[PDB]
Design a protein around this ligand. Sequence first.
Ligand SMILES: [Mg+2]
Ligand SMILES: [Mg+2]
Length: 114
Amino acid sequence: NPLIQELTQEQLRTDIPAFRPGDTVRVHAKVVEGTRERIQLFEGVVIKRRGAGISETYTVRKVSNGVGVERTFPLHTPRVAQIEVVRYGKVRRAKLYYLRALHGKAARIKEIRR
RNA sequence: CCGGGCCUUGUACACACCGCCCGUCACACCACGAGAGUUUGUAACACCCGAAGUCGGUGAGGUAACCUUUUUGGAGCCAGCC
Ligand SMILES: [Mg+2]
Ligand SMILES: [Mg+2]
């Protein structure tokens, strides 16, 4: 594990803010077609971060057209150019898996301003 | 017994009782009903969820007009939230 950290330190990334579960975040996710490269903004609430160092992943939930969507990303990708936090929600949890069963007015996170 | 004539009478008969005519069945057609159910539609009702929008309450964030010091603070407004 020390060797692991020493190896993976260079591919670790530092443009990340210290965001949490509960807080809304936009991901500038770039997708690749081979001929073009398009960034698209996936906004959503963060249900979980999990992992250590470079195995750290986080998921982001959205409700596009009445269909709950849930998109996991590794934290340290070159294919995610920016991670904009836009609300600092308050929760008493780390894993917000209760949000999968709710819809809308009950699935609302209480913003803090901090 | 048959036939004929005269009166009268009843009749749903009038090529006039060798008349008329009821009902079932067979055949063909038509329309309708009931029917295990199946399929559409309307209109409400009881709950759940709930867009936009008005209204109400908040608004430590943002804010050229107003008052203030002018060096900034306020009033008000807005985003946003409920
Ligand atoms: Mg006879
Ligand atoms: Mg019928």
